[PDB]
Coordinates of C-alpha atoms and ligand atoms in Angstrom, one line a residue:
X5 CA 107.7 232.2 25.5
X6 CA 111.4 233.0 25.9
X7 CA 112.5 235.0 28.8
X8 CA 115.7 237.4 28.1
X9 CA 117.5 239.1 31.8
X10 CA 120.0 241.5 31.7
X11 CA 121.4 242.4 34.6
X12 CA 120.8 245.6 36.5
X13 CA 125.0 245.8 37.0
X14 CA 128.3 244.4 37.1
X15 CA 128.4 241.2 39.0
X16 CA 132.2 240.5 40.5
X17 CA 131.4 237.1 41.5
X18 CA 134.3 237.2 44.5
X19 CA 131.5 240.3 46.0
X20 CA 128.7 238.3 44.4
X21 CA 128.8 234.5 44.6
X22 CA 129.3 233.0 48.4
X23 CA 128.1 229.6 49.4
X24 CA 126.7 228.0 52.6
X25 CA 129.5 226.6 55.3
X26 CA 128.9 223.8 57.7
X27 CA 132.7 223.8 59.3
X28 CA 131.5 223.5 62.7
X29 CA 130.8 219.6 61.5
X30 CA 134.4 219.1 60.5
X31 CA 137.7 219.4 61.8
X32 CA 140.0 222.0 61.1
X33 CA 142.2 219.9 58.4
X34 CA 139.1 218.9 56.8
X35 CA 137.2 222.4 56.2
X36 CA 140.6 224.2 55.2
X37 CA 140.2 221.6 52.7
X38 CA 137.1 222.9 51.5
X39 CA 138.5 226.4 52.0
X40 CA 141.1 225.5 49.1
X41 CA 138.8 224.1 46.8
X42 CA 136.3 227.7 47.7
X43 CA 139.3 229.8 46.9
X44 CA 140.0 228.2 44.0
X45 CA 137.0 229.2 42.5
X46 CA 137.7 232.7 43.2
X47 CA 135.2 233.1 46.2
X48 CA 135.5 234.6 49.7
X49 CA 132.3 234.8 50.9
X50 CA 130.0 232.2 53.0
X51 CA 127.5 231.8 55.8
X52 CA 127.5 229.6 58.8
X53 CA 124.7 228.1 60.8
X54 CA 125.0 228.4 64.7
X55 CA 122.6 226.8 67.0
X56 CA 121.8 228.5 70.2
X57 CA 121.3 225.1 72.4
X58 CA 124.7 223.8 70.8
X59 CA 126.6 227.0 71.8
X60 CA 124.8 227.6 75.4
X61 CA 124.2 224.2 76.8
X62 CA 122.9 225.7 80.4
X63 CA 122.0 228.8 81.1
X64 CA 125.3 231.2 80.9
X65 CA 127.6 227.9 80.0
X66 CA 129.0 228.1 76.8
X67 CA 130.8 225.9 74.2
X68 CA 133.1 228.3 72.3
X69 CA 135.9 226.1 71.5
X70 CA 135.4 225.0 68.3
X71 CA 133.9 228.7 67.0
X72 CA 136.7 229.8 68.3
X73 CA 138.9 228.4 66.5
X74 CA 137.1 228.3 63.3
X75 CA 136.8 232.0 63.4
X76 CA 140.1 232.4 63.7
X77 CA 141.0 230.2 60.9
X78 CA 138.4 232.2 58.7
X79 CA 140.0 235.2 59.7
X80 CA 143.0 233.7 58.5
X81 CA 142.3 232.5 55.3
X82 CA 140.6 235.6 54.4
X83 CA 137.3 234.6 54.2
X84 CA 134.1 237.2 54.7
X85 CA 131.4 235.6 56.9
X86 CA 128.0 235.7 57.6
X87 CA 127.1 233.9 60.8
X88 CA 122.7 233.0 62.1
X89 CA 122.1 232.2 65.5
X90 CA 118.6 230.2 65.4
X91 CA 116.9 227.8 67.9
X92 CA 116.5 228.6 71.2
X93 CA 118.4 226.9 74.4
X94 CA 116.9 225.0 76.7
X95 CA 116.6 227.5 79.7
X96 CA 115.0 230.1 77.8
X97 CA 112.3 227.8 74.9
X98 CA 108.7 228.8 74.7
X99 CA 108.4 224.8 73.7
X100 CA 105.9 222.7 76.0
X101 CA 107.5 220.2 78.7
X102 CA 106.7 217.7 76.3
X103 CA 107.9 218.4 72.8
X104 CA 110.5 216.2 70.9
X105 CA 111.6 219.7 69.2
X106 CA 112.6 222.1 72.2
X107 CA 115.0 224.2 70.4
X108 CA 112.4 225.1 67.2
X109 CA 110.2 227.2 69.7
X110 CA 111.4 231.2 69.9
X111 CA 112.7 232.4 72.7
X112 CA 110.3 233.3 75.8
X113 CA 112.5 236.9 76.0
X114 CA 114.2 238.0 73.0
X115 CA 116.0 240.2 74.9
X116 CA 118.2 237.5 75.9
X117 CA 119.0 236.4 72.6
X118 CA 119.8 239.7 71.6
X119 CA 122.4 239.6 74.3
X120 CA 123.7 236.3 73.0
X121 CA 124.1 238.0 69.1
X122 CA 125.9 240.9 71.0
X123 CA 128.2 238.6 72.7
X124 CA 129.1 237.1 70.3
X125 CA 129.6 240.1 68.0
X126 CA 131.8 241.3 70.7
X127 CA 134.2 238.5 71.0
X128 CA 134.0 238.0 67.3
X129 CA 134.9 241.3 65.7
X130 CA 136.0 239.6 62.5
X131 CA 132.6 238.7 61.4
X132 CA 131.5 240.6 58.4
X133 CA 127.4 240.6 59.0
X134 CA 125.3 238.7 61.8
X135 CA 121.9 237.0 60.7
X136 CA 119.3 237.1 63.0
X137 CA 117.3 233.5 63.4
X138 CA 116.3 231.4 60.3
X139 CA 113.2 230.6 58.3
X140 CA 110.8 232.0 60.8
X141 CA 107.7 231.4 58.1
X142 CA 108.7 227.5 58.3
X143 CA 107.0 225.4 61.2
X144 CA 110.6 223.9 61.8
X145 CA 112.2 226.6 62.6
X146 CA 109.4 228.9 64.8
X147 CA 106.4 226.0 66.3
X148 CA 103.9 225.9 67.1
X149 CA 102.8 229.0 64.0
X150 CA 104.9 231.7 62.2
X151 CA 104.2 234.7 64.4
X152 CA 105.4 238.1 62.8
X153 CA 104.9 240.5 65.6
X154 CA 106.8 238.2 67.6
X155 CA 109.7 237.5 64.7
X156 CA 109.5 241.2 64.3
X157 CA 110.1 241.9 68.3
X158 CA 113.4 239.7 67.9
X159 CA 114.7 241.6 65.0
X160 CA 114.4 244.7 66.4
X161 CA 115.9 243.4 70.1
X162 CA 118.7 241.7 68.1
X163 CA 119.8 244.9 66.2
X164 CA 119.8 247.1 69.1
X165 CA 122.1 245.4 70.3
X166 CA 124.2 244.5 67.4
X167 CA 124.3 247.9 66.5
X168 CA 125.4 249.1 70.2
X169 CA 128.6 246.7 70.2
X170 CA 129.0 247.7 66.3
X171 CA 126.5 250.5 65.0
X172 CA 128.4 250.1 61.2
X173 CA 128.4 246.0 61.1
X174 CA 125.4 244.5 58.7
X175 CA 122.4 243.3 60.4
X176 CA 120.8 240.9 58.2
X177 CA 116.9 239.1 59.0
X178 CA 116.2 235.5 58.7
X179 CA 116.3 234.1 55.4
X180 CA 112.9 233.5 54.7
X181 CA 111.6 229.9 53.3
X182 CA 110.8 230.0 49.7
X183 CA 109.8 233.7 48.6
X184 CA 108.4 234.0 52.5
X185 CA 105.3 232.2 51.9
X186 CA 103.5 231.6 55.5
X187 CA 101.0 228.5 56.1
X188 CA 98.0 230.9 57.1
X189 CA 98.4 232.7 53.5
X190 CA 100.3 235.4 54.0
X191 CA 104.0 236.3 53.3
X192 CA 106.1 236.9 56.4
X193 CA 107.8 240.1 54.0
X194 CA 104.3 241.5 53.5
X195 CA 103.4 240.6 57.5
X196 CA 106.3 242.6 58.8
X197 CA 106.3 245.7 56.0
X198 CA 102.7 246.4 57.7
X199 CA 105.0 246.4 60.9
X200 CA 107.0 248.8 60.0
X201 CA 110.0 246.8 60.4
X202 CA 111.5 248.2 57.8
X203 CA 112.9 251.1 60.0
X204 CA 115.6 248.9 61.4
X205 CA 117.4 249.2 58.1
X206 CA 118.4 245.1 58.3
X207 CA 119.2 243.5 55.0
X208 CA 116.4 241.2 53.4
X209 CA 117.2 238.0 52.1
X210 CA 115.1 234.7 50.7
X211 CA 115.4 231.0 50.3
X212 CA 113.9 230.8 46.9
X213 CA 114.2 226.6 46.0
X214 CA 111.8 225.6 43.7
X215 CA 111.9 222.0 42.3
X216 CA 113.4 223.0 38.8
X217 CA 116.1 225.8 38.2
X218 CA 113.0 228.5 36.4
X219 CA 110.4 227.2 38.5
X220 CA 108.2 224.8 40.2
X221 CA 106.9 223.1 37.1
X222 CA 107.3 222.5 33.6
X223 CA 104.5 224.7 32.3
X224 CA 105.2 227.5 34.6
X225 CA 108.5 228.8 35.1
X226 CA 107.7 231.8 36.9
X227 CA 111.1 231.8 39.1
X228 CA 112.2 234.6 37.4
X229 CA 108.8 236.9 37.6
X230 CA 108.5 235.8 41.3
X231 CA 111.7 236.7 42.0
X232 CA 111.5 240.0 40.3
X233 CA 108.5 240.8 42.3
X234 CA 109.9 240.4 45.5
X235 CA 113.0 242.3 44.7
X236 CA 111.4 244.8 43.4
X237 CA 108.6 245.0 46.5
X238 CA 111.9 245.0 48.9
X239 CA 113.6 248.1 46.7
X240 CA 110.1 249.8 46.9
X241 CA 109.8 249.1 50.9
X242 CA 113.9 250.9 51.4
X243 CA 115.7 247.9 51.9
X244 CA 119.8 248.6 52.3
X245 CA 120.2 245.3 50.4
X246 CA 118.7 242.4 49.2
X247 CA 120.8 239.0 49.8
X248 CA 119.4 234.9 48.9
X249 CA 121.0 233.8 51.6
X250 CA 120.2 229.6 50.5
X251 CA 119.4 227.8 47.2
X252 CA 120.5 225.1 45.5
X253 CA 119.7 221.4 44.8
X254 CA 120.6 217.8 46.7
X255 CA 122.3 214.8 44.3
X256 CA 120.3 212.6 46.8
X257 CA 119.3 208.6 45.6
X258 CA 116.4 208.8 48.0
X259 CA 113.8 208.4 49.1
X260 CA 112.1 211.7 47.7
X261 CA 111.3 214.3 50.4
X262 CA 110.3 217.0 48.7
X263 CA 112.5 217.1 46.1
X264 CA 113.0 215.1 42.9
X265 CA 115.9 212.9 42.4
X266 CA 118.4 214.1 40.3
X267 CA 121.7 212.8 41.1
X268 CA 124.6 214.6 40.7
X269 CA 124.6 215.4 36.9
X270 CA 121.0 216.9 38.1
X271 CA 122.8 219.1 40.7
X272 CA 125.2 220.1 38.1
X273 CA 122.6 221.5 35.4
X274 CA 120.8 223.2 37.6
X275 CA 122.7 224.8 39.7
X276 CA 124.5 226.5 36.8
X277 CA 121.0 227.4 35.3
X278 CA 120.0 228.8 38.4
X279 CA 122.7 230.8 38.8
X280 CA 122.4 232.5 35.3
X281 CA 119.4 233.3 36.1
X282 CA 119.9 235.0 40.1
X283 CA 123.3 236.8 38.9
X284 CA 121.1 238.5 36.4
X285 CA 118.4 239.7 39.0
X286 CA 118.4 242.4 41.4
X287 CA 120.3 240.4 44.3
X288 CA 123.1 242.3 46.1
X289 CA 124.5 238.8 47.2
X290 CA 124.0 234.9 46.8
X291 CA 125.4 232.5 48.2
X292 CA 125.1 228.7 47.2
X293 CA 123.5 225.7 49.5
X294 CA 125.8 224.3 50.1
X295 CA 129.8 223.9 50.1
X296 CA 130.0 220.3 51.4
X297 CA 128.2 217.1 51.7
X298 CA 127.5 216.2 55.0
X299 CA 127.4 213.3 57.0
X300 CA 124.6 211.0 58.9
X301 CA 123.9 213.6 61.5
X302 CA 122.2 215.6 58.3
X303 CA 118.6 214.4 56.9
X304 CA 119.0 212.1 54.0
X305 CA 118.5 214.7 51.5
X306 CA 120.8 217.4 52.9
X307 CA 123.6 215.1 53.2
X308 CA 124.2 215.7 49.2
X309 CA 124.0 219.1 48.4
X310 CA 127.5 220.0 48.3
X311 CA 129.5 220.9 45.7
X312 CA 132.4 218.8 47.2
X313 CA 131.9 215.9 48.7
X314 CA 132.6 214.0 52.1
X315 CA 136.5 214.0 51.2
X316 CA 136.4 217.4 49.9
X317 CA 136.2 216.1 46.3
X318 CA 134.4 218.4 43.4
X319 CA 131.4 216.6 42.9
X320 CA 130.5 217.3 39.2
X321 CA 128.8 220.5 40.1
X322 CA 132.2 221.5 41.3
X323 CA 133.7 220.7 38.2
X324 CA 130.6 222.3 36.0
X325 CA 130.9 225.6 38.6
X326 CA 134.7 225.8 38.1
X327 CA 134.5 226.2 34.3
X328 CA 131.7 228.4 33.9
X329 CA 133.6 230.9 36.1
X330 CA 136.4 230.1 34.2
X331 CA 134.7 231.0 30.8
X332 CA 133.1 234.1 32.7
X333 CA 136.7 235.6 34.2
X334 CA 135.6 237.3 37.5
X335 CA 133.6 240.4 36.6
X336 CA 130.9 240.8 33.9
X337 CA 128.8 243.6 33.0
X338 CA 125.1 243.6 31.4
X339 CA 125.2 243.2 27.7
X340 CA 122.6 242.5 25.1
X341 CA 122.2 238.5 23.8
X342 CA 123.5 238.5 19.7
X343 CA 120.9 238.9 17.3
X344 CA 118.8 235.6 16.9
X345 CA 116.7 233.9 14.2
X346 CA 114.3 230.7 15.2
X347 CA 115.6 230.7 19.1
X348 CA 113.4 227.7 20.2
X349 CA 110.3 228.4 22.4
X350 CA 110.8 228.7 26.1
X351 CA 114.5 229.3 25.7
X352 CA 116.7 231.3 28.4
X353 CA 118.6 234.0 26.9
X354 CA 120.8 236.5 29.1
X355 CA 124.0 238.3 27.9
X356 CA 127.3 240.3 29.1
X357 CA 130.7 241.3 28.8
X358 CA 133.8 239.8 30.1
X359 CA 136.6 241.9 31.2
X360 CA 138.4 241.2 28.1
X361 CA 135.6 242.9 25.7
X362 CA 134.3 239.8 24.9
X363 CA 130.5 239.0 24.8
X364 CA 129.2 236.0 26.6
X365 CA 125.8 234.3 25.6
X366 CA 123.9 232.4 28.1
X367 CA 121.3 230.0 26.8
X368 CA 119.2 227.0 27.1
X369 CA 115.3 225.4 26.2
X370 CA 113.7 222.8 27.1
X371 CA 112.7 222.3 23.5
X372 CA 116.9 221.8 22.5
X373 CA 116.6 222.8 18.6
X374 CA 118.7 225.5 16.8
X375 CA 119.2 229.1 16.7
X376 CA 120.8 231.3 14.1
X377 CA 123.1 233.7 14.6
X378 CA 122.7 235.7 11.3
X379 CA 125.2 238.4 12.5
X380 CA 128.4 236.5 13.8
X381 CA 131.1 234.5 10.9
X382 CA 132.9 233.4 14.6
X383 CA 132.1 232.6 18.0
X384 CA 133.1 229.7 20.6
X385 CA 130.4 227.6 22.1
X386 CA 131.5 226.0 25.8
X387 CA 129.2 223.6 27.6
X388 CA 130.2 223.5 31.3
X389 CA 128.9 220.5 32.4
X390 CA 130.8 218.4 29.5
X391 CA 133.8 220.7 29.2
X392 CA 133.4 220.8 25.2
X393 CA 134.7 223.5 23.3
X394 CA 133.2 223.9 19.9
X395 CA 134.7 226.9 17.3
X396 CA 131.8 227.8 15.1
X397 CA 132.6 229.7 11.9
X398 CA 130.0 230.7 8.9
X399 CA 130.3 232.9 6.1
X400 CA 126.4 234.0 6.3
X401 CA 125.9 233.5 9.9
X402 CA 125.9 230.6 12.5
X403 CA 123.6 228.0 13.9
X404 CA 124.3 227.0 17.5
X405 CA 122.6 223.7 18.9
X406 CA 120.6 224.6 21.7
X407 CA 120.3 222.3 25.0
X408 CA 118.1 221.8 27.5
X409 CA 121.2 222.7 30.3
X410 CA 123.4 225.6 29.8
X411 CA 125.6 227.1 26.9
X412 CA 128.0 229.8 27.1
X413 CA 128.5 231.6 23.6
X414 CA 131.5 233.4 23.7
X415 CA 132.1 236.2 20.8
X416 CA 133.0 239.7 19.6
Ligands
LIG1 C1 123.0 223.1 57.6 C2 121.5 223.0 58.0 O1 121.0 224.3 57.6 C3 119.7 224.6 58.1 O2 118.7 223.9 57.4 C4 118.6 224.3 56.0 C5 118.3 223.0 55.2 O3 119.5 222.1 55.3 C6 118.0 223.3 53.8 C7 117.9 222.1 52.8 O4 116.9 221.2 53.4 N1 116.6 224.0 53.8 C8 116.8 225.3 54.5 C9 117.4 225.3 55.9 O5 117.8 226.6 56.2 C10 119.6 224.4 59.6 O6 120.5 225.3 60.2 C11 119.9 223.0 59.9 O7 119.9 222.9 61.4 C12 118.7 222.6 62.0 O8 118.5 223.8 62.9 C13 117.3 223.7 63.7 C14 117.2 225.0 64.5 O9 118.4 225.1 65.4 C15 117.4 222.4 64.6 O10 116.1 222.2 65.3 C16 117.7 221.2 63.7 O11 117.9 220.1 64.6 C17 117.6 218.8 64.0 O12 116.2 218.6 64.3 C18 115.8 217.4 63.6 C19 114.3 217.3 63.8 O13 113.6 218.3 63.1 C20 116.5 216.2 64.2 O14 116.2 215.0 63.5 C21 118.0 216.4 64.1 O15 118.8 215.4 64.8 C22 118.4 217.8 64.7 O16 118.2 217.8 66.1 C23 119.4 217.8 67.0 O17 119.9 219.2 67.0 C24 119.0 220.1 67.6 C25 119.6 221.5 67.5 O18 120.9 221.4 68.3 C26 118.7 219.7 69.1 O19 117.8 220.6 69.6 C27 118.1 218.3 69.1 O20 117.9 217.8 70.4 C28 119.0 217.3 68.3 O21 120.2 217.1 69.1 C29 118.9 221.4 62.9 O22 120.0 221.6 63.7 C30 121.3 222.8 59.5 O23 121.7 221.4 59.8
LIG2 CL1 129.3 225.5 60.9
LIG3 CL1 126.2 225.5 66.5
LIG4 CL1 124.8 239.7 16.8

């Protein structure tokens, strides 16, 4: 069963690749740090969590400090930002007296956190787009149950009054958990289309993380179906854009929550397979979880998915990420895969040009095996996560080994 993509148009990756942020955890020598290594890869763009009960710590008294300055180092370096505002502060929780989690209970008056996104809109005006909450279909983030009338009556209270401070500025919804699956059965994207919410124009964007790069298990790697599904359901609803606004995979030891250990070779392979496949799908924007390891104050698992570690180090995921771009240049357009003979079963298979001309082959199985090339006498095979660079010649064709991580074929 092999699955060929081809893109639906050019991908620059400086418009198309961001990643996650967590600078707010950091000082200021230590996340321009990361903002070197992010630049050096060619990228601009990347989202930031805020937490309501971090930034409002009474009702109408604010910690802005530390945003403030960050923003204006962002600003500064020339970075485009997406920033969420999720939780709720303590004076204004639905949470009982009682619960451990006060700030992962909506507001009791979304009006008032609409006034928060606006203020901060306001004294922000450097901010490229503003995300409204976070995984509202994950009991974590919205208790005691996902509600969409009432996730739906935030939205629209939030863009009114982003749009009245600046009615051209991007309003983006939550990124939904996994392809917006909800507990009760439903899907929170299916939930608020029969609400109509749709009308308030906001962009649409999904956490898609399954446990392996095509899917959740060996035997059915349906990432790419699912994903085309939903895409193609948001096109079909009148969505400005569609952004994945989180995905990506922790080099954790353990214990396992949730997801399998890896490591950090793990992280490596399939982050680059999962992002040949999303830059081939109808996403406007993705953008990586996450720049930066973190430190204790993060879960055990999302201490590791960075691509740089505590020091602002490339982990090897850096490394792999920083030659695949390099291989790629920084614009490709869809393009046809060379002609094949024998390409093992289950094998990915997506092509495109480089600015040069040149075509690039993107390929892998979980089989490994062969494939001939029955067309080519020349082409250069590059395995990111290795850095090998292999010149293959043949006077009646070639045969190109195929692995079960990610080959870039580059030829005329
Ligand atoms: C960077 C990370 O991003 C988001 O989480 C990602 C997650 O990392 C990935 C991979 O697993 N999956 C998708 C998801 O989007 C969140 O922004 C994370 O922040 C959280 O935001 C919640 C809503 O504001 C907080 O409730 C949450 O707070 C933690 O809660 C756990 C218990 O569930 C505590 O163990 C932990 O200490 C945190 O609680 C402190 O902070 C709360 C928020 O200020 C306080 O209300 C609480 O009293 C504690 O001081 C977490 O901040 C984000 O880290
Ligand atoms: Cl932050
Ligand atoms: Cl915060
Ligand atoms: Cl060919």
């Amino acid at each position: 069963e092999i699955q060929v993509l081809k893109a639906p148009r050019a991908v620059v990756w400086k418009d198309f690749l961001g990643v996650n942020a967590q600078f707010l955890w950091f000082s200021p020598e230590r996340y321009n740090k990361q903002i070197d290594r992010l630049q050096d890869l060619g990228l601009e763009w990347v989202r930031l969590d805020l937490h309501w009960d971090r930034l409002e710590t009474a009702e109408d008294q604010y910690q802005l400090a530390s945003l403030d300055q960050l923003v204006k180092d962002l600003e500064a370096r020339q970075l485009k930002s997406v920033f969420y505002l999720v939780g709720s502060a303590r004076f204004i929780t639905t949470a009982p007296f009682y619960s451990p989690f006060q700030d992962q209970y909506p507001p009791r008056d979304p009006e008032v956190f609409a006034r928060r996104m606006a203020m901060l809109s306001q004294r922000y005006p450097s901010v490229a787009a503003w995300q409204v909450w976070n995984e509202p279909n994950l009991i974590g983030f919205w208790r005691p149950k996902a509600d969409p009338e009432g996730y739906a009556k935030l939205l629209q209270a939030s863009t009114i009054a982003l749009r009245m401070v600046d009615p051209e500025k991007p309003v983006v919804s939550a990124g939904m958990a996994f392809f917006s699956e909800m507990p009760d059965g439903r899907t929170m994207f299916d939930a608020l289309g029969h609400l109509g919410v749709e009308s308030l124009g906001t962009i649409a964007t999904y956490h898609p993380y399954t446990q392996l790069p095509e899917g959740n298990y060996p035997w059915n790697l349906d990432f790419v179906s699912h994903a085309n599904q939903i895409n193609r359901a948001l096109r079909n609803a009148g969505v400005p854009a569609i952004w994945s606004t989180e995905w990506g995979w922790s080099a954790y030891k353990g214990p396992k929550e949730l997801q399998d250990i890896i490591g950090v070779e793990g992280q490596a392979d399939y982050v680059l397979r999962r992002l040949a496949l999303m830059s081939a799908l109808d996403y406007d924007r993705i953008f990586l979880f996450t720049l930066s390891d973190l430190d204790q104050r993060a879960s055990v698992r999302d201490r590791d998915y960075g691509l740089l570690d505590l020091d602002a180090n490339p982990k090897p995921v850096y490394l792999a990420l920083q030659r695949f771009l390099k291989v790629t240049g920084p614009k490709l357009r869809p393009a046809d895969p060379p002609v094949t003979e024998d390409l093992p079963d289950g094998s990915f298979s997506i092509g495109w040009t480089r600015e040069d001309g040149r075509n690039v082959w993107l390929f892998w199985s979980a089989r490994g095996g062969n494939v001939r090339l029955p067309k080519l006498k020349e082409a250069t095979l590059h395995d990111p996560l290795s850095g090998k660079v292999t010149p293959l010649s043949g006077s009646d064709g070639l045969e190109v080994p195929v692995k079960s991580s990610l080959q870039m074929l580059v030829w005329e």
